[PDB]
Amino acid sequence: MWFEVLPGIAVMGVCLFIPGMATARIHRFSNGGKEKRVAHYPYQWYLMERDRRVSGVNRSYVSKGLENID
Amino acid sequence: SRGEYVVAKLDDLINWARRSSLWPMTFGLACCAVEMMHMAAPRYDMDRFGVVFRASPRQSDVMIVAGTLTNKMAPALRKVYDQMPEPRYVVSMGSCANGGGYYHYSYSVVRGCDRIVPVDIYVPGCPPTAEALLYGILQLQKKIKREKRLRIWYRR
Amino acid sequence: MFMINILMLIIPILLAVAFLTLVERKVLGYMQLRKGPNVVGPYGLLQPIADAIKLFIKEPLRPATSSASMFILAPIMALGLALTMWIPLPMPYPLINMNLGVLFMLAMSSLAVYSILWSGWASNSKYALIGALRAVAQTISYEVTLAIILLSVLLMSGSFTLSTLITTQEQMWLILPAWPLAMMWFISTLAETNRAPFDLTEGESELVSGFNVEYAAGPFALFFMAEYANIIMMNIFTAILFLGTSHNPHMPELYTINFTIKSLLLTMSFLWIRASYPRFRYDQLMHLLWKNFLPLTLALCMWHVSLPILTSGIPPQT
Amino acid sequence: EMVRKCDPHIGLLHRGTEKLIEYKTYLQALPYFDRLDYVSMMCNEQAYSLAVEKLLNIRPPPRAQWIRVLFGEITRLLNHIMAVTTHALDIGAMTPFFWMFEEREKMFEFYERVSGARMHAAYVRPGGVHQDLPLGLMDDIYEFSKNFSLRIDELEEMLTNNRIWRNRTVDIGIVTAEDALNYGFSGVMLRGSGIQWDLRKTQPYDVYDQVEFDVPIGSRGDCYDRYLCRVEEMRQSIRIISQCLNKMPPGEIKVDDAKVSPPKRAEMKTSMESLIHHFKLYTEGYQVPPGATYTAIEAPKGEFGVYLVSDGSSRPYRCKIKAPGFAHLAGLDKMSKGHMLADVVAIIGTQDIVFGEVDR
Amino acid sequence: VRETFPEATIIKPAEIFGREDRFLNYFANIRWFGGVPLISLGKKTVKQPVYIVDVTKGIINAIKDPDARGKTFAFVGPSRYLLFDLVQYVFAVAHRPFLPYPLPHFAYRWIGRLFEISPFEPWTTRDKVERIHTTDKILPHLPGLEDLGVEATPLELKAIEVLRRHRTYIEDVQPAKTIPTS
Amino acid sequence: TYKYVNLREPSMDMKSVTDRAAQTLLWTELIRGLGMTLSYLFREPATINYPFEKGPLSPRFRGEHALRRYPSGEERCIACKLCEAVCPAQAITIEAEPRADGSRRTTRYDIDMTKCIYCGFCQEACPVDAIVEGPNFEFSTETHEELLYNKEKLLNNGDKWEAEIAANIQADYLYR
Amino acid sequence: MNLMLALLTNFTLATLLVIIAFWLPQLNVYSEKTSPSARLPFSMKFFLVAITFLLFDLEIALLLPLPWASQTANLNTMLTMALFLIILLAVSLAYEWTQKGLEWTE
Amino acid sequence: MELLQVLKRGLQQVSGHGGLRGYLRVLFRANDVRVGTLVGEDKYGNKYYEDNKQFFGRHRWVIYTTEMNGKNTFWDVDGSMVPPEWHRWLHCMTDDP
Numbered sequence A: 001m002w003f004e005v006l007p008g009i010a011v012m013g014v015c016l017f018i019p020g021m022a023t024a025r026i027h028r029f030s031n032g033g034k035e036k037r038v039a040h041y042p043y044q045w046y047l048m049e050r051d052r053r054v055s056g057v058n059r060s061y062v063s064k065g066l067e068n069i070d
Numbered sequence B: 001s002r003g004e005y006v007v008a009k010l011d012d013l014i015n016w017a018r019r020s021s022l023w024p025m026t027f028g029l030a031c032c033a034v035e036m037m038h039m040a041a042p043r044y045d046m047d048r049f050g051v052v053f054r055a056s057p058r059q060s061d062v063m064i065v066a067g068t069l070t071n072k073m074a075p076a077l078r079k080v081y082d083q084m085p086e087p088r089y090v091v092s093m094g095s096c097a098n099g100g101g102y103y104h105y106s107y108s109v110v111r112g113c114d115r116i117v118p119v120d121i122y123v124p125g126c127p128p129t130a131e132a133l134l135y136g137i138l139q140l141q142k143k144i145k146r147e148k149r150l151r152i153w154y155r156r
Numbered sequence C: 001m002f003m004i005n006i007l008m009l010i011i012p013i014l015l016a017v018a019f020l021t022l023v024e025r026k027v028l029g030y031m032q033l034r035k036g037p038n039v040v041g042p043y044g045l046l047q048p049i050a051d052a053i054k055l056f057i058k059e060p061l062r063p064a065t066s067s068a069s070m071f072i073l074a075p076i077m078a079l080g081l082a083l084t085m086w087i088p089l090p091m092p093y094p095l096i097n098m099n100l101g102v103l104f105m106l107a108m109s110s111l112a113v114y115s116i117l118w119s120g121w122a123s124n125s126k127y128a129l130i131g132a133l134r135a136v137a138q139t140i141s142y143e144v145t146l147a148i149i150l151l152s153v154l155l156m157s158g159s160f161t162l163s164t165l166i167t168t169q170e171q172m173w174l175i176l177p178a179w180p181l182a183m184m185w186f187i188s189t190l191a192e193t194n195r196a197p198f199d200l201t202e203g204e205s206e207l208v209s210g211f212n213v214e215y216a217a218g219p220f221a222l223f224f225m226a227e228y229a230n231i232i233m234m235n236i237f238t239a240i241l242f243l244g245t246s247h248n249p250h251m252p253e254l255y256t257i258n259f260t261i262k263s264l265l266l267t268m269s270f271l272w273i274r275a276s277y278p279r280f281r282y283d284q285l286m287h288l289l290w291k292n293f294l295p296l297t298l299a300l301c302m303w304h305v306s307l308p309i310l311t312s313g314i315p316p317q318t
Numbered sequence D: 001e002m003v004r005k006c007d008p009h010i011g012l013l014h015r016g017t018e019k020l021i022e023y024k025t026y027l028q029a030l031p032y033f034d035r036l037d038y039v040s041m042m043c044n045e046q047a048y049s050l051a052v053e054k055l056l057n058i059r060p061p062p063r064a065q066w067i068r069v070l071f072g073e074i075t076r077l078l079n080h081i082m083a084v085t086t087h088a089l090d091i092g093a094m095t096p097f098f099w100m101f102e103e104r105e106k107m108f109e110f111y112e113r114v115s116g117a118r119m120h121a122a123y124v125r126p127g128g129v130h131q132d133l134p135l136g137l138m139d140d141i142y143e144f145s146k147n148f149s150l151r152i153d154e155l156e157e158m159l160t161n162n163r164i165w166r167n168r169t170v171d172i173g174i175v176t177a178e179d180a181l182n183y184g185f186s187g188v189m190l191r192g193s194g195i196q197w198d199l200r201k202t203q204p205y206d207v208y209d210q211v212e213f214d215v216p217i218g219s220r221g222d223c224y225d226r227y228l229c230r231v232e233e234m235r236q237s238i239r240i241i242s243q244c245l246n247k248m249p250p251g252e253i254k255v256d257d258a259k260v261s262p263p264k265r266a267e268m269k270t271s272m273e274s275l276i277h278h279f280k281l282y283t284e285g286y287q288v289p290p291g292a293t294y295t296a297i298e299a300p301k302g303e304f305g306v307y308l309v310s311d312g313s314s315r316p317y318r319c320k321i322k323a324p325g326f327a328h329l330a331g332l333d334k335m336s337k338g339h340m341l342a343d344v345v346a347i348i349g350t351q352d353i354v355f356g357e358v359d360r
Numbered sequence E: 001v002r003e004t005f006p007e008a009t010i011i012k013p014a015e016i017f018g019r020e021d022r023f024l025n026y027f028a029n030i031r032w033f034g035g036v037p038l039i040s041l042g043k044k045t046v047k048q049p050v051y052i053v054d055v056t057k058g059i060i061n062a063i064k065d066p067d068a069r070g071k072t073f074a075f076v077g078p079s080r081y082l083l084f085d086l087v088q089y090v091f092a093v094a095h096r097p098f099l100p101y102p103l104p105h106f107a108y109r110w111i112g113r114l115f116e117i118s119p120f121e122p123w124t125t126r127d128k129v130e131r132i133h134t135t136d137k138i139l140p141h142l143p144g145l146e147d148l149g150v151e152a153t154p155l156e157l158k159a160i161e162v163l164r165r166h167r168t169y170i171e172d173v174q175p176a177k178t179i180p181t182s
Numbered sequence F: 001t002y003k004y005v006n007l008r009e010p011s012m013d014m015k016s017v018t019d020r021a022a023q024t025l026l027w028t029e030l031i032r033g034l035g036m037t038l039s040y041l042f043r044e045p046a047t048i049n050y051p052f053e054k055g056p057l058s059p060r061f062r063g064e065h066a067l068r069r070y071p072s073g074e075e076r077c078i079a080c081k082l083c084e085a086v087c088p089a090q091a092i093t094i095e096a097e098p099r100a101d102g103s104r105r106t107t108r109y110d111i112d113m114t115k116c117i118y119c120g121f122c123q124e125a126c127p128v129d130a131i132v133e134g135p136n137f138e139f140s141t142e143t144h145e146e147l148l149y150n151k152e153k154l155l156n157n158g159d160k161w162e163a164e165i166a167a168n169i170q171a172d173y174l175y176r
Numbered sequence G: 001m002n003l004m005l006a007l008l009t010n011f012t013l014a015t016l017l018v019i020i021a022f023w024l025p026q027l028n029v030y031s032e033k034t035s036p037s038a039r040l041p042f043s044m045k046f047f048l049v050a051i052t053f054l055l056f057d058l059e060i061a062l063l064l065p066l067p068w069a070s071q072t073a074n075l076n077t078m079l080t081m082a083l084f085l086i087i088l089l090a091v092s093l094a095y096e097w098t099q100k101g102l103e104w105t106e
Numbered sequence H: 001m002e003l004l005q006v007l008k009r010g011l012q013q014v015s016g017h018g019g020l021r022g023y024l025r026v027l028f029r030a031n032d033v034r035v036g037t038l039v040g041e042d043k044y045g046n047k048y049y050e051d052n053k054q055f056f057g058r059h060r061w062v063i064y065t066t067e068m069n070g071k072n073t074f075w076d077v078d079g080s081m082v083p084p085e086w087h088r089w090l091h092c093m094t095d096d097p
């Protein structure tokens, strides 16, 4: 019956699902649980470089808030 | 962890792949080709065994000779056989291909395709039923399953 | 970490291609009132594995190639480019976030025609080369509409960034404002990938289509994998382009599930179409492109340049 | 792209059938006719049987004649499914082949239930048919025929209005009426060009003048009109089969003259005369009075005929087989002029060529 | 064998050439590597190869010949050649570029050893090189092909048959120089 | 009587011209063809599960040959050679002589199954139902020589298949 | 760096698959077989489809900046020149069409 | 509710073959998990089933013995294993087993 085609489709579906799921999870693993920063234009890259300096640990995804104000 | 064991299991793997993925080149010469087409048709669906219906001679693993082989045609059949990549097998389908059949005594007919190519399975009938041909294909699968290429290599 | 990401893209791609071969045979089987592979593994789930092993231990074909370097380069180019087409795709996040990702995909696909040309050159056969040239002429012809159609849709998106297509379709699928472009886009992808009813490389009108003809070729498996990776990729691109999935930043997996289903369904429609129609003649598919799609695509490009301006709906640049 | 010359080289299935027949008795030669147009087996048998019955100056009984028309039209369905769907399969439309070959598989069962063979039945013989229909067969033929026109409609849904199919067939291989006649075409190769000819109507045999059907006629003489004619001929065959089922008479199924048709096995084992006639018919065979006939029928592929020469003995002196596909293929060069390579595949399909009959 | 089965027919052929030979095909496949080594320079080695069909006919004629029982035959070709000329001719028929270069046995034994490591038919081995560079014995006390009614086939008449497949894609050919007959 | 298959002139009013334009541009008749293949996808396939399931046959089926006996075990064949005379393929070779007890019996009965066309003429001609074509069709072999049946092979087939052969004869002999 | 690594990985794997696709069959050690510029003639039509593709493809290069061009203040000028380019692309097709540059009959 | 009745039948087939181990045995030997009425068993261990609701051609089937004449036929089955008495029934040459 036609539903015996589904097992092969399910295998295809899992294979196509993995790259998208992996990229999202690896991005959050590598950027402190947040989305990887998007820098398409120099202004965005300029702020990312500034964050890397401001962090004090050389990672742009380490955010400093009002605790650094004084 | 003997070499006999590993060679034995590797034989089973390659034998399994080769028999589970048999791509035929059907040489539809005459009436028997019709029954071959009924083996691909829905009732028997040869494709469900892993036997693709229409495969090019460049990727084929088995040649099915389905019909009378005439003298004028014998050179072209041998040429296709010589161009088949290995491992290659030949199934002779029907009385004409098996031994000449109804036309055995003709001036223009090759008396069995096994004068031209080596034949692995002979399927009798005029024509063999689609089911008879399928039986013969499944017989070839079991013959491939019995192959011992790596065991023989290991004992050379 | 990035090296893991690459392998978590490449390996699943090769597995999807493997099992698409099984899905095609079973879907085509049931539309033909039969089953397709159901003996090698339960529901034929081992059939792709048996075919793969069988092909790689098969003897290489004869005759010898005319050019060894081009004989080896063609399959490398086909498969290398096929995998490269996947790296900017947002699912919902891309492996490589390009500002000009759409243009990158156009550029890389236009290079896929070289494997056809090189394999024809290395075939050592006059007739096989002529077959390759007809295939190239088909491919480049339909590249014209894909580029112009793509440009027309981006006038509603506002940039060449693939992930911006997601934002553009946050309210509504682009297929509604652009269904005429979607129709011609979808057919162009069929003709671009040499799929039925445009599969003349596998047809009956070629000088080399004769069964008893021979020329240097192969490996068959590598070319086959490259082709089917492009079928899936084009249908993934089609979904993103016209059937944009909503993205929730806190639940990216929901995007991926919904996005995967749409891509699968579009891919199944390629199989659906292959089961339904006869094959075009070479001159007739040229006529379809040059005398039907192209005049209408140029007109719709004019319309989609004008429409955002006259409705005050120009999209943002960033 | 253009074809300038088409030179078919045949003989690759020439098996010297005509020379072999001269060494067989008339019964022994009957199975050779199954293996000519091996898609229209029982129609080939009927043609040979009519020719022999004519030289013998005997006629088969009415029930045999209705059985021969019934299975003649079942055979036309077998042939047209093959002709149409392999024509479609060879230009890429593969799916109708599978749907309709399941229908062919069920008509193979009718062949097997009357003869014990799916294809080469050897069932129609000079004098009638070999055996009477098994009980329950006509009911199953009725059940098959009841649903078959729906199967034809599904085929038409795939092809008839399809623009791709029409592009591959319309105005391809146009044949004028005058050329069709002089090139020796027959069957649909004639009716596609508007010629109003059909041997069942004009020179009827068996009981074809007792059944009602219409001859489909084309208007453009191209591949598409010949495709429409074949599809419509399948509908007419169903219409004829419907009348054969209702009008099937009772009685014996082979001529009641034991110097031509063998006696019943029960008679052969009790009567001295029957045993002698059984012995002689299966060894020497019946003698055929000297003479020559050209006998033709409207086979599914066109006019199929035999020029049969008897020298007065039990073996034919000469048997020339007129295969309709022989003249049709001879016209391939004429028809392919001004067309492309892809069109030659369509033209060969529209001619409905089986090399069993072309090469003999 | 002569002690066990005294009436045995022993046939002692020279290197045999033919479609499936490992002689002409051996030299043709040396081209598959740029180097074309040769003990000395292919000199000091004289070869008298015999055609495969000639050996076959000789064997068959031996089965049918009552005289042949208990004898020892030597099957050799008609013409003796220098190993350098033969290989040069082989490359000329195969339309290949011929690049000779000298080597002694010690440097020719390591290449032989290096390919002996293969778990299949080696491309070459020390023993194969030693046999190739063994001069073909002249044994005039033994009967040959002519005693069995077989005419030895010249190599020049059959080289194309064997080496046509090795060509890359006027037939000057240049017949190889033959050592003066005894 | 005859009918035209293609002699309709299309109407040329707006309603009709625009219907044809919609078909051209909106691919409607192409979509219809997709509907038919989709409908088949949801139909049960016609495939049987060979070799666990078998295609139907009838008692008349012409398969592998066999030589039969009387209930006592005596051979039915009395070497009349009607089968050898009628065989269209000359597939039968027979020799005979008086048996030790004086009975008329064959010493050779060969069928070249690669000459045979499986026509069933031999079993029609046989006056004592000695030679028959049984129901077996699954006897393909790996060598050509295995298909050259001698009398021993054919008698073994009779003893092997008689249970089924007798029932099939019982079912069809009144049609003969 | 990442894009270079991705391209290197993709074409490295493609290369390995190709060489093992060419070496793995040599494990079988199959038997030896021992049994096997100028015009084409090339049709002018196949050359002219390639050239037409190129010239149309060059005009597409000029149209690619349209998404950015629509951000300008001089929209009237931009729209006039955008439609001008597409129209000349149509005029090229019309000229080819009406001189039978798109035919395949000889 | 029809979709749930289909799922019930699917799980009812698992019980019909004697549990998961029996269900997988038939699935891998015969690529078919239908449950039918047992019609009989021959002396070699072949089991014959019928289901008259199936369409003609699938209404009768045999599950081959796993060992016949000393041959292990767990995986290697063959249509020639059906003895003549059942051959007539399995090929529908007759109605009665």
Ligand SMILES: CCCCCCCCCCCCCCCCCC(=O)OC[C@H](COP(=O)(O)OCCN)OC(=O)CCCCCCCCCCCCCCCCC
Binding pocket: C180, C181, C182, C183, C184, C186, C187, C197, C273, C277, C288, C292, C293, C296, C303, D163, F024, F025, F026, F027, F030, F031
């Ligand atoms: C308010 C005003 C706004 C302004 C914009 C208004 C625009 C709307 C009005 C225009 C409508 C445009 C329609 C777009 C489709 C293109 C139409 C077309 O070109 O099709 C015709 C083409 C040729 O047709 P033919 O009959 O052979 O010959 C005619 C020429 N002599 O024939 C074909 O192309 C047929 C297709 C060939 C391929 C067949 C195989 C595929 C069929 C299945 C596809 C299923 C649907 C796919 C949908 C995918 C969506 C993702």
Ligand SMILES: CCCCCCCCCCCCCCCCCC(=O)OC[C@H](COP(=O)(O)OCCN)OC(=O)CCCCCCCCCCCCCCCCC
Binding pocket: C175, C179, C183, C243, C265, C268, C269, C272, F019, F023, F026, F027, F028, F029, F031, F032, F033, F034, F035, F036, F038
């Ligand atoms: C692998 C299979 C996956 C599927 C899984 C199961 C779900 C099935 C969903 C598929 C739906 C399509 C299948 C049904 C199609 C059959 C229906 C049909 O036959 O309609 C025919 C109809 C009449 O045609 P005709 O007779 O020629 O009339 C002409 C003048 N009235 O003709 C028509 O009216 C056609 C009307 C539509 C024309 C639209 C033209 C194309 C426009 C493209 C837009 C695509 C949008 C959808 C894409 C997917 C995104 C959701």
Ligand SMILES: CCCCCCCCCCCCO[C@@H]1O[C@H](CO)[C@@H](O[C@H]2O[C@H](CO)[C@@H](O)[C@H](O)[C@H]2O)[C@H](O)[C@H]1O
Binding pocket: B052, B054, B055, B056, B059, C014, C015, C017, C018, C021, C024, C025, C048, C051, C052, C202, C221, C224, C225
């Ligand atoms: C990890 C994955 C490794 C890669 C595994 C690749 C497995 C490939 C399995 C292919 C299964 C068979 O799939 C089927 O193959 C044949 C080719 O013979 C194709 O056949 C098609 O191409 C050939 C020419 O190439 C034509 O002669 C044929 O008429 C056409 O239909 C079918 O379109 C395809 O459906």
Ligand code: SF4
Binding pocket: B030, B031, B032, B033, B066, B067, B068, B093, B094, B095, B096, B097, B101, B102, B125, B126, B127, B128, D035, D038
């Ligand atoms: S064996 Fe019989 S059916 Fe087959 S080709 Fe010969 S005559 Fe025709």
Ligand code: SF4
Binding pocket: F083, F086, F087, F088, F089, F090, F091, F092, F111, F115, F116, F117, F118, F119, F120, F121, F122, F123, F133
């Ligand atoms: S079936 Fe026909 S061909 Fe075969 S042995 Fe009997 S009579 Fe001869």
Ligand code: SF4
Binding pocket: F076, F077, F078, F079, F080, F081, F082, F083, F084, F094, F122, F125, F126, F127, F128, F129, F130, F131
């Ligand atoms: S099998 Fe019958 S016909 Fe043949 S010789 Fe014996 S008794 Fe006579």
